[PDB]
Design a protein around this ligand. Structure first.
Ligand SMILES: CCCCCCCCCCCC(=O)SCCNC(=O)CCNC(=O)[C@H](O)C(C)(C)COP(=O)(O)O
Ligand code: SF4
Ligand code: SF4
Lengths: 208, 176, 112, 85, 385, 113
């Protein structure tokens, strides 16, 4: 229960918890869950219409100066209609604390841009615009990062093939590089390594 | 626990001052620093005389693949097809089929060095210690096709190097 | 007084104590027009008050950064200023209505 | 420089001559470019911008919300060129 | 003004940037850093692979330091599996984490010197980086992109021969840094090229999330070791450089100090490695010795499984920062509990720096800009991905 | 129901597209000369008319306005003399074989759907 096991830090869990109810007090209007795992990792909801007003508050001291948007990590789950799950990782430097505060959005919901508030999201912007289509409040430019020029796709939508539909090559008489239909050789020979028989009864969503 | 860099304040003392202005003029330290590069002229140069000399390599070293045999002269491969399940780039392709003798045997083992990333997983993964990431490294080709190896070429590679490969394994086997 | 703040963006502002009392009286001045009911207001009260008395606890700039248990509070005047713009922001958020709109249960239903 | 009105309409119709999508017979003093002429909206934009390129001034598409008759084009020109004599 | 695309092609561009400038006479106005010329898109490529398969990807982002990347993965995977490694593995991860740090800083130093046209240190010190690649080769069979650090810990035990020669290796190295001490550190031309260039106020740094020496140069003291001694760093003695002016000269001297600092640490890690497994006891995560798998059944069974479907993380999506020499490093896992990740974003420390460069660009002449890329230790591989 | 991107109802959106067409329709020769396209310029304008036709089934104003957002964003890369001649030619796919919509030929070709 020790040589392999990583010890559970109850203390920080206690402090983060208590601060968690503290914040739960402070912004009832958007804050929801106050998740607190044994990893010492706190988490909190925000409604997307509540993106900016919460985040600004975060930067300003209460007992945690949530300075430096370290990340706007993003996840797409097709099942939920609110398929997008934008996440604000954060770190109050003065208090050496860390927190994860996320949201959700639909394909045509103009979620608020923290560009005015953090500016670090001038690109967390355009990536998460481009890879997805998560339209953003008001940004100086929504021009694509990463993906090419005429490129139409939105990879990381967890949709359409990992190769994509596009596969460019130089061509002769046109004297120029041209995009072409894929035609993969050998093909990504995907292995379904999923295991029937649950190893974790403690979890397990009920059949209901 | 932190340390300031620099920060230190230079002396106003007249000896030290006129010395610094003497650096500002007569350059002094440049030559001192300059003098240092001269020290290299007198050192012996570090080039290995390739290819009549070659760089040191540990026995572990990863390189060209080769299938290899039993001491009896049967091929070690049993087509367990887990090395196909591991090759992170999935370079490997295997069609296991029965031998007329009935033994499991690959009919078309093959791998392309174009997609191989030489992580050398398969050297570790194989239960029968069939395939081996051999010592050889120098084998650049005129054409792409010469890279897409059949089981055949790999067997040949296990033929030329088997003394060597088995020798290195003889050096290494305890660690695994 | 120590020469050089050390930090790059920060700059010295002599007689910090007075400037801080300015900030205490002013963020107090804005919290007062915020309704008592808003959950933030009582705690920002606790903060401005306990910190103001805490500045009063000692005179010199020197041990003052010990009394608040923070190195160079010469920065926290700036943080207090963020706190001031924040408290200015509290007004347009109004008094805090508990929650608005809720997730379909599928949201936050982790795993999947 | 005089900007005589009838010659303005001559100018616009000549632009319609150079213009492709309209039939030369379909050319007329009144027939609407949305409600009469069968040319689509992109053709609306096409003539409206060719014409404004002739007149050398921007025509907001709010006037395309107006437009109506070509007679209201020359009419607007009377309200635009403001010579109207 | 005159619109102008720059790299990749410039040696200064490092084969990656295309930061177009709309130059005036030579003073910059517009100066946008385009990227996605290297974007390997590994985020989806991580998703369709067993967690043991993900491991190479991190050697593939930080080209130079390598072991630190994999350690950045082993920490983040062992968290969800709640697994705590045998101590020897951690002394190793620190040992080669620091030797990777020597490789990384030697890289940044000598290349930054090359853009300043110094030429020589390059050849004075890669003579050493081959001396270290001989070592990663002695422990991995690969000169670089060694996979020797693993989520269970480590592939394999250290060969008996190293323990002496490595000491020998660092028996003389301090002098080799002395030879630089007699160059740029004191040299006149060098100060002018770098003094008072790209100075950054503490707040912009805290806004953009600058980290590492890039904070420590401008005086912010934020650090990912002593604040969170995630491994043996808590036992290790060392001391952290902090800059004053925010001068590139500052950041420079810091990196030289960290190199000294690893000269301090690696001494102690050589001084303190326990005997013990360098792997976890469990065969449900850490695979059996070839000697045992080929007799005992269960060893061969789980052997067969980890090499075919692998260990299963309990479900969860998490994030972990890393003390990369270049800064905070991003490990954003999203795991359904299947060995396949559901998602995995990777924040490069250099991403924020490159986001911040244009702020430092405008109002500076082009040589200042060439100075700036070398200011920030940016290997572009990690940044677009 | 749900809050709109920009335009609400088609006309707030329809206004934006025309702004787009001219924004291309004038820009085209500039592109013809910057990249020295061998295409006759009317072909360029025709393609300009065509890409505005592929989006004919659009009916939500959020879809229209999001399409002109992305289309103007493409215009950004065009006007700034970004891209390359090849990228401009990607719209043509001239290297590719013509597709026979006729079912009989579809029979003659291969297994297909
Ligand atoms: C060298 C040149 C390169 C070519 C580049 C091509 C770039 C094209 C950019 C693509 C962006 C879009 O699709 S723009 C998105 C807008 N497209 C739509 O279809 C929205 C709904 N349109 C309608 O409802 C009407 O039928 C309407 C079609 C407007 C007709 O207007 P009228 O009937 O009322 O006159
Ligand atoms: S090595 Fe020989 S046995 Fe092991 S998988 Fe590859 S082929 Fe099958
Ligand atoms: S060499 Fe490395 S990559 Fe190529 S197959 Fe063997 S393991 Fe997979």
């Amino acid at each position: 229960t020790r040589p392999t096991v990583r010890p559970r830090n109850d203390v920080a869990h206690k402090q983060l918890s208590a601060f968690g109810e503290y914040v739960a007090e402070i912004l009832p209007k958007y804050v929801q869950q106050v998740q607190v795992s044994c990893f010492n990792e706190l988490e909190v909801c925000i409604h997307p219409d509540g993106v900016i007003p919460v985040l600004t508050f975060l930067r300003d001291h209460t007992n945690a100066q949530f300075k430096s948007l370290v990340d706007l990590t993003a996840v797409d789950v097709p099942t939920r209609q609110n398929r997008f799950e934008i996440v604000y990782n954060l770190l109050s430097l003065r208090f050496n604390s860390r927190i994860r505060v996320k949201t959700y959005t639909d394909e045509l919901t103009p979620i608020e841009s923290a560009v005015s508030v953090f500016k670090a999201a001038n690109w967390y912007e355009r990536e998460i615009w481009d890879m997805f289509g998560v339209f953003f409040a008001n940004h100086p430019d929504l021009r694509r990062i990463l993906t090419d020029y005429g490129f139409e796709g939105h990879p990381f939508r967890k949709d359409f093939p990992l190769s994509g539909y596009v596969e460019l090559r130089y061509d002769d008489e046109v004297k120029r590089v041209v995009a072409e239909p894929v035609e993969l050789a050998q093909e990504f020979r995907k292995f379904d390594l999923n295991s029937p028989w649950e190893a974790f009864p403690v979890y397990r969503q009920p059949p209901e | 626990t932190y340390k300031y860099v620099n920060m230190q304040d230079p002396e106003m003392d007249m000896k030290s001052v006129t010395d610094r202005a003497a650096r500002t003029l007569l350059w002094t330290e440049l030559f001192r620093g300059l003098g240092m590069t001269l020290s290299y002229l007198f050192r012996e140069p570090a080039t290995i005389n390739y290819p009549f000399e070659k760089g040191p390599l540990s026995p572990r070293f990863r390189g060209e693949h080769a299938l290899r045999r039993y001491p009896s002269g049967e091929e070690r491969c049993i087509a367990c097809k887990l090395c196909e399940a591991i090759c992170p780039a999935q370079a490997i392709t295997i069609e296991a089929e029965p031998r007329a003798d009935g033994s499991r045997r690959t009919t078309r083992y093959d791998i392309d060095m174009t997609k191989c990333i030489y992580c050398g997983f398969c050297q570790e993964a194989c239960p029968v210690d069939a395939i081996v990431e051999g010592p050889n490294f120098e084998f650049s080709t005129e054409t792409h096709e010469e890279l897409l190896y059949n089981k055949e070429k790999l067997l040949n590679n296990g033929d030329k190097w088997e003394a060597e490969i088995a020798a290195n394994i003889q050096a290494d086997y305890l660690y695994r | 007084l120590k020469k050089t703040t050390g930090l790059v963006g920060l700059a010295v502002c002599n007689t910090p104590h007075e400037r801080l009392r300015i900030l205490y009286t002013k963020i107090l001045d804005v919290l007062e027009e915020i309704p008592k009911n808003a959950a933030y207001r009582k705690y920002t009260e606790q903060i401005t008050n306990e910190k103001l008395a805490m500045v009063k606890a000692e005179p010199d700039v020197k041990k003052l950064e010990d009394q608040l248990q923070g190195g160079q509070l010469e920065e926290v005047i700036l943080q207090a200023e963020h706190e001031l713009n924040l408290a200015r922001k509290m007004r347009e958020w109004k008094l805090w209505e508990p929650l608005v709109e809720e997730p379909p249960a599928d949201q936050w239903k982790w795993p999947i | 420089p005089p900007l005589t009105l009838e010659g303005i309409q001559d100018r616009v119709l000549y632009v319609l001559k150079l213009y492709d999508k309209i039939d030369p017979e379909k050319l007329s003093v009144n027939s609407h470019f949305m409600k009469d002429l069968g040319l689509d909206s992109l053709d609306q934009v096409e003539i409206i911008m060719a014409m404004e390129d002739e007149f050398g001034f921007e025509i907001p598409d709010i006037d395309a919300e107006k437009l109506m008759c070509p007679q209201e084009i020359v009419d607007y020109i009377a309200d635009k060129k403001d010579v109207y004599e | 003004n005159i619109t102008l695309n720059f790299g990749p092609q410039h040696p200064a561009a490092h084969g990656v940037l295309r930061l177009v400038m709309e130059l005036s006479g030579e003073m910059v106005r517009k100066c946008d850093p385009h990227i996605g010329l290297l974007h390997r898109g590994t985020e989806k490529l991580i998703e369709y692979k067993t967690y043991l398969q993900a491991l190479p990807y991190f050697d593939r982002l930080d080209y130079v330091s390598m072991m630190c990347n994999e350690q950045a993965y082993s920490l983040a995977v062992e968290k969800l599996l709640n697994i705590r490694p045998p101590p020897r593995a951690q002394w190793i991860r620190v040992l080669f984490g620091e030797i990777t740090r020597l490789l990384n800083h030697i890289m940044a130093v000598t290349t930054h010197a090359l853009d300043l046209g110094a030429m020589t240190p390059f050849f004075w010190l890669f003579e050493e980086r081959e001396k270290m690649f001989e070592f990663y080769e002695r422990v991995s069979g690969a000169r670089m992109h060694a996979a020797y650090i693993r989520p269970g810990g480590v592939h394999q035990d250290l060969p008996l021969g190293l323990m002496d020669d490595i000491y020998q290796f660092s028996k003389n190295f301090s002098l080799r840094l002395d030879e630089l001490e007699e160059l740029l550190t004191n040299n006149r031309i060098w100060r002018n090229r770098t003094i008072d260039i790209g100075v950054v106020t503490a707040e912009e740094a805290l806004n953009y999330g600058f980290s590492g020496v890039m904070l420590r140069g401008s005086g912010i003291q934020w650090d990912l070791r002593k604040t969170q001694p995630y491994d043996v760093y808590d036992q290790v003695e060392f001391d952290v450089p902090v800059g004053s002016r925010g001068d590139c000269y500052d950041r420079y001297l810091c990196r030289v100090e960290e190199m000294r600092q690893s000269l301090r640490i690696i001494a102690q890690c050589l001084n303190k490695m326990p005997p013990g497994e360098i792997k976890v006891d469990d065969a449900k995560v850490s695979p059996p010795k070839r000697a045992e798998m080929k007799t005992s059944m269960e060893s061969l069974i789980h052997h067969f499984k980890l090499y075919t479907e692998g260990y299963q993380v309990p479900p969860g999506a998490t994030y972990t920062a890393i003390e990369a020499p270049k800064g905070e490093f991003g490990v954003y896992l999203v795991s359904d509990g299947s060995s396949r990740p559901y998602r995995c974003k990777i924040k490069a420390p250099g991403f924020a720096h490159l986001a911040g460069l244009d702020k430092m660009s405008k109002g500076h002449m082009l040589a200042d800009v060439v100075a700036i890329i070398g200011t920030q230790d940016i290997v572009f591989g990690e940044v677009d991905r | 129901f749900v809050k709109p991107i920009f335009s609400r109802d088609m006309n707030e959106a329809k206004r934006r597209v025309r702004e787009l067409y001219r924004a291309w329709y004038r820009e085209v020769p500039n592109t013809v000369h910057q990249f020295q396209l061998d295409i006759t310029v009317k072909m360029g304008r025709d393609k300009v008319r065509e890409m505005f036709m592929k989006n004919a089934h659009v009916t939500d104003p959020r879809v229209v306005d999001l399409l002109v957002i992305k289309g103007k964003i493409e215009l950004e890369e065009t006007i700034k003399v970004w891209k390359q001649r090849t990228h401009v030619m990607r719209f043509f796919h001239e290297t590719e074989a013509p597709r026979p919509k006729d079912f009989l030929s579809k029979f003659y070709v291969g297994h297909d759907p």
